[PDB]
Amino acid sequence: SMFLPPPECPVFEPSWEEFADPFAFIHKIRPIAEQTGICKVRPPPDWQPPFACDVDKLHFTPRIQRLNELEAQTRVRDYTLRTFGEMADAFKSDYFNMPVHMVPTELVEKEFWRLVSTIEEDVTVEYGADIASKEFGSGFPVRDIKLSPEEEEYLDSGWNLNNMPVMEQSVLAHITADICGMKLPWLYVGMCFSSFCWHIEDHWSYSINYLHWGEPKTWYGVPGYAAEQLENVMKKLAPELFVSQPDLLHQLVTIMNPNTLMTHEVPVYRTNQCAGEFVITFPRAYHSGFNQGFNFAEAVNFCTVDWLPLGRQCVEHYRLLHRYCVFSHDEMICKMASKADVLDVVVASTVQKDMAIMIEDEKALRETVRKLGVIDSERMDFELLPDDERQCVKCKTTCFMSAISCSCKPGLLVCLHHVKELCSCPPYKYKLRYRYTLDDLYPMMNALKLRAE
Numbered sequence: 001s002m003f004l005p006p007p008e009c010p011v012f013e014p015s016w017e018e019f020a021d022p023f024a025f026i027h028k029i030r031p032i033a034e035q036t037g038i039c040k041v042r043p044p045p046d047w048q049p050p051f052a053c054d055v056d057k058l059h060f061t062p063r064i065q066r067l068n069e070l071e072a073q074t075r076v077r078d079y080t081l082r083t084f085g086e087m088a089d090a091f092k093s094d095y096f097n098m099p100v101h102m103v104p105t106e107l108v109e110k111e112f113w114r115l116v117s118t119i120e121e122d123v124t125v126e127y128g129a130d131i132a133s134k135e136f137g138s139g140f141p142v143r144d145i146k147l148s149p150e151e152e153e154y155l156d157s158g159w160n161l162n163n164m165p166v167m168e169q170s171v172l173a174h175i176t177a178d179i180c181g182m183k184l185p186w187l188y189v190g191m192c193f194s195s196f197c198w199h200i201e202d203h204w205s206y207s208i209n210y211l212h213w214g215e216p217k218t219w220y221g222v223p224g225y226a227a228e229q230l231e232n233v234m235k236k237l238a239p240e241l242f243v244s245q246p247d248l249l250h251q252l253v254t255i256m257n258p259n260t261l262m263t264h265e266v267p268v269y270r271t272n273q274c275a276g277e278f279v280i281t282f283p284r285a286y287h288s289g290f291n292q293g294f295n296f297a298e299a300v301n302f303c304t305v306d307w308l309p310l311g312r313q314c315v316e317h318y319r320l321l322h323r324y325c326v327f328s329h330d331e332m333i334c335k336m337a338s339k340a341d342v343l344d345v346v347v348a349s350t351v352q353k354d355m356a357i358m359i360e361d362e363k364a365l366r367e368t369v370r371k372l373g374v375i376d377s378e379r380m381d382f383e384l385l386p387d388d389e390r391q392c393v394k395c396k397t398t399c400f401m402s403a404i405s406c407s408c409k410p411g412l413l414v415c416l417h418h419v420k421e422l423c424s425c426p427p428y429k430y431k432l433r434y435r436y437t438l439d440d441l442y443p444m445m446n447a448l449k450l451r452a453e
């Protein structure tokens with residue numbers, strides 16, 4: 001009646017040995033956690049990174065939030081950490097006429113789902129969300145200022161989240177394209193009821209989130225295999241969130257009761273994440289939640305070799321939906337291949353397999369456009385073009401392997417799936433622009449094969 005909480009998600013407490021290597025561990029729990037979409041990770045007891053900072057010297061600009069179920073929010077007037085905290089604590093304490101630590105988590109959860117479902121209640125809250133900058137930086141230790149020998153052990157940790165993008169079992173590593181939103185950590189300052197709507201990460205990547213201090217964060221999560229069920233359910237009840245958007249800052253997202261999803265047979269899991277705990281989201285796992293009170297978290301995207309085939313499927317899916325890519329997947333594969341001699345050996349074996357599918361798809365597409373009568377061709381270094389200058393006019397995919405142009409419409413490109421969509425000139429006026437000949441590609445792949453023995 002009213003709110004029936006979803007079953008709890010898996011919890012992991014690894015030993016110092018298991019905990020040593022982030023990617024080994026995440027690869028270990030993967031067959032479990034991928035069935036529930038999210039999971040929680042408790043570090044060893046002696047693992048306490050030193051959060052330290054001035055609550056007075058760090059300023060930020062707050063975002064405002066209305067709390068209404070099925071109402072649309074867009075994915076992406078000054079507070080210090082101290083003045084925000086004073087506001088958040090007063091708010092929660094006045095809402096319940098209790099001292100903040102005495103409000104049971106069970107009750108804030110029930111209350112949250114009641115107030116978003118009621119039209120008479122116009123509750124608004126505020127929060128902070130921004131990538132790490134100089135005006136406001138990471139909660140983890142970084143290099144600059146001299147550091148105490150404890151901050152040193154934590155400085156190179158796998159679980160320091162400034163380090164995780166740029167390690168070498170991460171594939172998003174050697175991307176030289178700037179994808180700052182997706183390589184740098186984000187900082188979140190929460191208060192009671194401030195929330196995050198149902199979403200999946202760009203390019204179906206993993207994410208990892210650490211709560212530094214404060215009151216808990218409540219999460220809901222759906223496993224990757226149920227993603228499309230969840231999307232069907234959400235199209236019936238809020239079809240406005242699915243009207244296609246002019247870009248990627250304008251993706252529409254919403255709050256929705258997990259009981260609604262459970263009624264339509266979507267599996268959902270919950271957890272409360274407390275200070276010093278990690279939550280991990282797996283590829284294409286939908287998730288949402290809200291904060292129990294004043295707190296501070298930090299989070300980052302990342303991609304393992306596991307993910308590479310889903311990254312290809314996802315870019316394919318983006319094309320069907322005509323939505324924008326954050327980076328070119330093919331451009332990343334080729335960049336890694338061009339660094340094949342310094343690649344980790346299991347990485348090189350996995351890239352080579354994805355490159356083989358890439359090449360074979362590209363062969364077929366080029367034969368198809370040839371039989372359409374496109375005859376002229378010229379090499380072109382796509383990676384030098386700004387992204388907005390190389391998106392398919394039809395499906396908006398970011399071009400890298402190849403594209404069709406026409407002197408008729410200078411500057412415009414279509415990918416090889418949308419040759420019919422550039423203009424009305426006969427196909428002999430068109431030109432095939434291409435990064436690599438088939439003959440350049442096979443030696444790139446061979447170098448990968450050698451590296452992997």
Ligand SMILES: O=C(Nc1cccnc1)c1cc(Cl)sc1Cl
Nearest residue numbers: 075076129130188195196197209
């Ligand atoms: O909170 C946010 N995102 C989030 C948080 C935790 C897990 N996944 C996603 C977020 C980012 C914005 Cl920009 S406005 C909000 Cl709200």
Ligand SMILES: [Cl-]
Nearest residue numbers: 067115118121
């Ligand atoms: Cl409301």
Ligand SMILES: [Mn+2]
Nearest residue numbers: 199200201207
């Ligand atoms: Mn997220």
Ligand SMILES: [Zn+2]
Nearest residue numbers: 392395415418
């Ligand atoms: Zn296209």
Ligand SMILES: [Zn+2]
Nearest residue numbers: 406408423425
């Ligand atoms: Zn033309």
